[PDB]
Amino acid sequence: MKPYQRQFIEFALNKQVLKFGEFTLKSGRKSPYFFNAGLFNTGRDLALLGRFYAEALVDSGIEFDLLFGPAYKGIPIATTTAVALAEHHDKDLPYCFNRKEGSLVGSALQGRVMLVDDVITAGTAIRESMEIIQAHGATLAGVLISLDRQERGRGEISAIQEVERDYGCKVISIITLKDLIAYLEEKPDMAEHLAAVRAYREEFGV
Amino acid sequence: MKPYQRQFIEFALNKQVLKFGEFTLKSGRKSPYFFNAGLFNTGRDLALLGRFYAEALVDSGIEFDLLFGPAYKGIPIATTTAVALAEHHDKDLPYCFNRKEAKDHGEGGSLVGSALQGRVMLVDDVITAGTAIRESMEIIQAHGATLAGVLISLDRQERGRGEISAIQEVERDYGCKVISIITLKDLIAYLEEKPDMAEHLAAVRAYREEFGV
Ligand SMILES: O=P(O)(O)OC[C@H]1O[C@H](OP(=O)(O)OP(=O)(O)O)[C@H](O)[C@@H]1O
Ligand SMILES: O=C(O)c1cc(=O)[nH]c(=O)[nH]1
Ligand SMILES: O=C(O)c1cc(=O)[nH]c(=O)[nH]1
Ligand SMILES: [Mg+2]
């Protein structure tokens, strides 16, 4: 784990973004933990979050012509990421997002799209976004999320490998479940939660 | 006017958000100028727009405890505005936005971000009919909070369906204060300084005379 990843983890934890309980994921999976990016709830949180995303984007070297954020979590995420790119990297990118109701807000959806979202579990959201992206004649160059939960997709291979294989894109993340776990191994009163996570990973992990 | 207002006008003009000609408004009137805030659609546009909104909020001095951006157009505005306040004014504010429908899994609920509480600053681009606010007010009330103000980009300052303006209708029907980056009068004052904008200035003056205030 690099220093910036440790910083991101501590940032997320200081904001109670990582929750433990009986959750039912978008994919229907019953998870013992949930990463809620909606909890980066103040302007300072949003600002820093965008800085993390922009840094990852520029460091990746992936070429893209537009930033797309799927509703709803992707909306504030794409907005602050777009702002960070312009303010700190001198990169002025057209941005776009959809209505969850398709109907789009922002620039025209064209070119090589960089989709930014909070997490990737089974790859459902990415698949839903692609319906919209392909409907506008655009392509998918990459996907960047805060947390790669490192779970399988619709089959046996990881959700990431499936997405990369299906759309010929590159998926990158700020941190992975592994990084999060390594960090938590250092903290007290986490044993039970970590055990629960492992039990879960034995079933959907890859 | 303040420098940020002058700067906002040039910015809007630059990105073609503000344009002159003949446009049929929702009311059916023929306006000699139109403001399409939806044209601010790149990262830099978003960055600057948030800086201007923040300037306008700080200028007003109105106190608030939450920045609320109604779905969907208000989400990016509230987001970039929240970022500008924290980055350029050292004012860290909670933000929040609504979902059009409840989430059937995960964290559930119909709100994203902060809890809807306290003196809310509603963030938007423009107010035409002056009724889209009622919907957001409903949500704000459903959570027991109060509407402290409404932040918009441009106040067209033209009467609604009867005598008063859409903005004045909002302030009287909700008891809040509407903060605007600029107004029709600021536009007139701007064109006044630019000699080439002579013919447009005249058309905008005529329109304000007939529909203004
Ligand atoms: O890789 P996946 O299996 O698709 O899981 C992750 C996705 O699920 C959540 O969206 P969701 O629509 O559930 O929440 P939102 O409406 O708050 O964005 C999350 O924001 C990701 O987009
Ligand atoms: O898979 C999901 O629905 C999911 C998992 C998670 O950790 N966070 C989130 O917002 N969604
Ligand atoms: O009143 C309107 O229809 C209207 C005027 C304007 O300048 N901008 C906008 O979006 N609507
Ligand atoms: Mg989502």
Swiss-Prot record, chain A:
Binding residues for orotate: 34-35, 121, 149
SUPFAM superfamilies, per the entry: PRTase-like
Entry coiled-coil feature ranges: none
Name of one Pfam family that matches: Pribosyltran
Key words of the record: Glycosyltransferase, Magnesium, Pyrimidine biosynthesis, Transferase
GO cellular component: cytoplasm
Pathway in which this enzyme or protein is active: Pyrimidine metabolism; UMP biosynthesis via de novo pathway; UMP from orotate: step 1/2
Phenotype upon changing residue 73 to A/Q: Significant loss of activity
Molecular-function annotations in GO: magnesium ion binding; orotate phosphoribosyltransferase activity
Name the record gives this protein: Orotate phosphoribosyltransferase
Organism: Salmonella typhimurium (strain LT2 / SGSC1412 / ATCC 700720)
Gene from which this protein is expressed: pyrE
